[PDB]
Amino acid sequence: MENITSGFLGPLLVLQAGFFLLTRILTIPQSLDSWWTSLNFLGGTTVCLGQNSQSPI
């Protein structure tokens, strides 16, 4: 509106608006990853594949 016309926030506004869409898209990737993980789990669960003791985790 008036503030948009009277300010240079437009580039920052675009960066922020795309940030929300980028976050949603990135969540879509992890969400699909979890969905497939459950699918392959097929009524099951698992640990990280190479979760070896040679790691402080």
Added chain:
Amino acid sequence: SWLSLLVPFVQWFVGLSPTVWLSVIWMMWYWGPSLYSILSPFLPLLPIFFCLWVYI
């Protein structure tokens, strides 16, 4: 329209030879995890408004 501008960007960059894709494939992949982890400090996309004012 900026997508059309990036189309020439892809034309000149992606339109490279096998001698460039070969380097970009494997060695970049090895640094790719490290590069992604480093880019995490720039995950706030500060360079985004950076080049935004660059255009400004």
Added chain:
Amino acid sequence: MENITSGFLGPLLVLQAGFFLLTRILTIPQSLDSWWTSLNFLGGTTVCLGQNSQSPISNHSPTSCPPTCPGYRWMCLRRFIIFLFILLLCLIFLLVLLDYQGMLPVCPLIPGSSTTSTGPCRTCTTPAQGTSMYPSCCCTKPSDGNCTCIPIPSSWAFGKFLWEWASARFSWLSLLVPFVQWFVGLSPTVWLSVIWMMWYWGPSLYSILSPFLPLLPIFFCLWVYI
């Protein structure tokens, strides 16, 4: 009612942007601390061995050693020093980016005879003092009135003139520049192989060459005598 909604939406976006900017600024010290810890430790402990048990002795002392143990203290001083170092470092990148824009100036003044002008010279420069060096070109020569020197080149600009000027101080480096030309003359599909071989053997090559240091001076003396 329509006008109020737009202002409310704009203020919320402004607040979110400010919060994101502050979070990024703070995480810059956090990311720097994480990188420094990874470099120093590379598989070490981060319990902040400088932590103290005079307060809750839970191992919550981060790389920043939160709060009590150092905390708002020597650890915070290190964090602020790292932030200042980062602010200094980004200035170099900003300067390089601004320089390679062609707003940047590279007005050079070195001894030469290259000519590109319209109906030039026939008076030229006759300076028999101050060697061959040239001063600011308002009119460099002691008696030059119609003088015109050389304009900044779009290519390189800052750095190229300094390189040329310093090549006089160390001509051997200028002579050795042929090796740099050969290395640049190497094909693009050679850097990866060079790095891989260097990474594979560079530690071993340095270790083996460290004992070889005495052998090199004898060969150098023989070559000098020859």
Added chain:
Amino acid sequence: MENITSGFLGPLLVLQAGFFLLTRILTIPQSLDSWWTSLNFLGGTTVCLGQNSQSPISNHSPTSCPPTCPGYRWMCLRRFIIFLFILLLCLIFLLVLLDYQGMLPVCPLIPGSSTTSTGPCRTCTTPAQGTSMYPSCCCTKPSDGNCTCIPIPSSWAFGKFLWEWASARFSWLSLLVPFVQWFVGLSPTVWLSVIWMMWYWGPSLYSILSPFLPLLPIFFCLWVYI
């Protein structure tokens, strides 16, 4: 002997001086490990993370617990990174020293009617869009125009000219020149006070402002609406 002795010793003296320089460089690496520990002094002591139970050795400071085998790629990589940072710092220091020299021209541009000496304008009229950083001013214009332009003026102001060039981008920052001037005045007393104050401030003023940090955006937005 004499010259023949000098000629023979040229290689020997070269080897000796090169080994002294290599000792200085290794100290630069050893001292770099020292500042790495100083950063780790926030964390604490200097136990080796790279040293492991394999290759039976003792424990020492982070640089030299069986460094080569135990340090392996991690210690070498950290040393190389520190050496690169040190070289970058040396380059920055050299650039600053060359900047303060004033041999380098800034070769700037600004609109004005001033002249260092007797300069006849002869109706100097040819303007252009973006008067700052105009054409080379080798009388590059629709005609010659009887042009006289700026030489590289004598001041540690090569960066000052760049700032003036970029000053137009943000007028508010230039408007803060009054606070800059006030900071310029009484700086030794200001330094003498803020050295202790900021140390005290760094301890608790940041913590105090932390609650105020979220409050600032709301008030700033409220004022901007006006």
Added chain:
Amino acid sequence: MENITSGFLGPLLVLQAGFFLLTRILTIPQSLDSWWTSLNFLGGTTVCLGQNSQSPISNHSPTSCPPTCPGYRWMCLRRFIIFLFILLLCLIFLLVLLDYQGMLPVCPLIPGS
């Protein structure tokens, strides 16, 4: 814009926009609560006041008894009082801001020619 004119989201849009401001204001209350807690701590820390064993909770710290641990009702009352105080303070600050606006007069009087 066009979507706003062609949709009834305006009420929902207002509800969502006020939600962000309400969240920021509520955070301001808890943020001030933490700030004062540190101030009273005065380079210290503490546990939740009435954090007694007659509650299936761990060692809550200060403003950590949410609504069932200990006298969380009293903690909530203190939070509400602090929120009212912060509201009064920010209202006073806003009044002081507009004070130098010049729209308001002082409408004073003094003897002179």
